[PDB]
């Protein structure tokens, strides 16, 4: 299946693995803090989806932001960024090699794009992964989903699992 072991650094400075995410339903979003529109929109969608899922099903789903820009996105940078969207949003970062291993595992494309206004941007896969409480992949959610189609979907999966 899509995913596998990782050793990353959480927004609090603690070193984590896939085992630190176990025990709760999880949604993983790969992004970068310097993203102008895509990532802020997707996370806003995710944060509002987290709350709607809870209201409708009673299930606490943990949103997870994984950085595809480790050169700029430090622990302090990721921490400050994640706190803006939802109080329950975990931020994961690491070494460019650590990030390479986890993106590979999740089949995520990421490539630095030179920019004049930004120093550069990271071109990447606009993806969400609904992992279960035993960290096994359940469903994928693309850019085309709205808060309602994400909520409805996640809620449908949880009940059938």
Residue ranges that bind Cu ion, judged by CB under 5 A: 31, 35, 38-39
* Residue 34, marked binder: no
Collect contacts of 132-135 with beta carbons under 8 A, ≥24 apart.
Answer: 132/25, 132/26, 132/161, 133/22, 133/23, 133/24, 133/25, 134/22, 135/3, 135/18, 135/19, 135/21, 135/22, 135/26
Residue 149 backbone dihedrals phi, psi, to 5 degrees: -75, -20
How far apart (Å, rounded) are the C-alpha atoms in residues 58 and 51? Answer: 10
Q: Is residue 86 annotated as involved in ligand binding?
A: no
Supply the minimum distance, in Å, between the C-beta of residue 160 and Cu ion.
31
Least distance between Cu ion and beta carbon 132 (Å): 25
- Closer residue to Cu ion (CB): 35 or 108: 35
**Ligand-binding site membership of 79 (annotated):** no
As measured in angstroms, the least distance from the Cβ of 104 to Cu ion is 19
Q: Which is nearer to Cu ion, 37 or 97 (CB)?
A: 37
Residue that the structure tokens 């997707």 belong to: 42
Q: Between 18 and 73, name the residue whose CB sits nearer to Cu ion.
A: 73
- Rg of the chain over Cα atoms, rounded to whole angstroms, equals 15
> Which residue's CB is nearer to Cu ion, number 27 or number 155?
27
CB atoms within 10 A of CB 78: 26
CB of 134 to Cu ion, least distance (A): 29
Per the annotation, binding residues for Cu cation are 35, 39, 124
Per the annotation, binding residues are 35, 39, 124
């Amino acid at each position: 299946a899509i995913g596998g072991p990782f050793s990353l650094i959480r927004d609090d400075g603690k070193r984590v693995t896939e085992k630190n995410l176990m025990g709760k339903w999880t949604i993983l979003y790969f992004g970068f803090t310097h993203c102008p529109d895509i990532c802020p929109d997707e996370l806003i969608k995710l944060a509002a989806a987290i709350d709607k899922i809870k209201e409708n099903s009673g299930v606490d789903v943990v949103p997870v932001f994984i950085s595809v820009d480790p050169e700029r996105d430090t622990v302090q940078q990721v921490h400050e960024y994640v706190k803006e969207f939802h109080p329950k949003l975990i931020g994961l970062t690491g070494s460019p090699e650590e990030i390479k291993s986890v993106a590979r595992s999740y089949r995520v494309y990421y490539m630095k794009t030179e920019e004049e206004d930004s120093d550069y941007l990271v071109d990447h896969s606009i993806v969400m992964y609904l992992m279960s409480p035993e960290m096994n992949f359940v469903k994928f959610y693309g850019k085309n989903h709205d808060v309602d189609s994400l909520t409805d979907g996640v809620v449908k999966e949880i009940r059938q699992y």
